[PDB]
């Protein structure tokens, strides 16, 4: 019997940005969550709905693993019932969330001298996000009634602003890689338990 | 679909783009201050010009949102600091003449050398050259040569440049809907939009000259004691009835009187308080000064320093392989990175400075949650006041005995508390008329209150009336004496050194009455008391988002700028100074002159 490929979600060499967060449908494998508490390298391990003790006694149908890179003080926005520039425009968790959230510092892989401008985020979106909705869009945010035919000018801003990741930044500005496991029970058979 | 909706939307584009350019303009400016090198001087000028040009494209975009239609007072504070054109209202000739003058006015001040053309031994640099001869010399002509011949070239090649600097910066402020340029420097203390807390730009003149009518009975006794003690050093030069000569106050202009303490001690047979012989014998280094300065701010409730504070900041002079301008500046680079740059040594003057330049960082760490245009002090003399109340608390013998520095059986008497206050009165009270008179001079040269012929006659008419200082030999109109100072040539505001004094005792009387002290104010201390540092942190975290009259009411309870704490600090000295001045002449006469023959 096989193990779950958690070595592709947590130890990936290049993560994604929070506007275009990845998602991996993990199913039909013997998931070992007991080595995740004892790793002692995750800065934040918050489990909503489930317990860290009940995670090896219960079996789930689908375990979705959403991975992205955010700032230091925006890890608190990845929580059921938060608001900000990430929990409303980039990655919104539903209010009845039933999963666990991983978060750990990655300053020595995601920050180069001079700036690592590969990670971006939605700064301006014309509405709010539904829970677990991802929309990659490069549309110029019409903040008025002019209108603007693509030309980024007066009160028509580009929504994807980049992250200024540098190795000399503070704790609250250093890149925290975040993996969000979202367990669920559906009307299919379930075989993901340790 | 409303202007206040598009204003917050525009500032979210600003705060998430200016923060990525202010860091690269400060990290590149940090690399020049640590490495004085021909390569790193351009990286602070290429990346420093990317932010200097960024604030010009946003100041042309932010003026499309009128400030009459926005009702949120937080947005109107960020847009008022962004819609100001500055020097963009001038033409191409006048803006080029201004930057040519400012790059040349700071050049003749810094690179002005003093030599005697008749003697080969009389040549020296500025620091530690010309600053040494004007401080620790006991002669009259040795100080007069370093004072007249310093303004014989720097005070003469800065007169026609500063004459054109008056008419250039007046058109910079008359087109910005201010009255003069003197009314542009009082625009930092301006508060509009709040009912009951309206502070006008013209009420700063009404407040500064009202605070001087109470500090003048204290200064007249400090001046009459310093003059009476200078009779024993120069018995054939100073009259004990008139005023003081200019070059005997301690340094090149006479701003601080700190170097006059070594000759005018109150009691010379008493042991002076010092930890310099208690830091080398205990083997203190550059880390232990800041490890013991960090425990002062943790004990009042302010948080610890960052981990990036200890690996990136420069504390020790890094050998001879690289030269670093290590004047003590506390660096707030933005994006949560807080550093500090100073050449530390094992002395008390660098132990109190480490408390002074970490109190700036505990202020910059407090308003980090604010937006980018509100990350500053409540006014200009508000940042330097919260940094120096820590220097007034880390020098008392209650703190120097708490960290094992001072002796456990060091006696404190009546004659010890005076000798500490006269070291403080020459640095704090003695610089108060010198700070007010120069800003009385700049606000009267920008208002057009003087013509050209009394340009240098009405400057020494104010030194012989406010600070009580005569000239040794008269200067004609070809001279220009105030431009020799650093803040006049490099065009800095100077009233921020007058209001930081009146605020640092309003704060300390507010932080000692919160810490429940029973006794005089100069023996007080705020450490080991969380209920006093949490009083200050509710003001430190505000930043510029609140007006400075409401930030004073958060800690003191008075919206005004008051004197009475500063007279309550020096009250054990002012009681003694009256009793030492029964036989002297309290007050001065303008008619005396050393060349009145």
Residue numbers in the entry:
A (entry chain E): 333 to 526
B (entry chain A): 19 to 615
What does the paper say about this structure?
The S trimer uses its receptor-binding domain (RBD) to bind with the host-cell receptor ACE2, followed by a substantial structural rearrangement to fuse the viral membrane with the host-cell membrane.
Specifically, the substituted K478 forms a new hydrogen bond (H-bond) with the main chain of N487 (also resides in loop), potentially stabilizing the key RBM loop. Of note, this substitution also results in the formation of two new H-bonds with ACE2 (including Y489 with ACE2 Y83, and F490 with ACE2 K31), enhancing the S-ACE2 interaction. Further inspection of the surface property showed that the T478K substitution makes the substituted site more positively charged and hydrophilic, which may strengthen RBM interaction with the negatively charged and hydrophilic ACE2 in the interaction interface. Collectively, this Delta variant RBM T478K substitution could stabilize and induce conformational change of the RBM loop and strengthen the interaction with ACE2 receptor, potentially leading to enhanced transmissibility of the Delta variant. Another mutation in the Delta variant RBD, L452R, is not involved in the interaction with ACE2, however, this mutation results in a hydrophilic, basic local surface property reverse, and an elongated side chain, which may affect the binding of MAbs targeting this region, potentially leading to immune evasion.
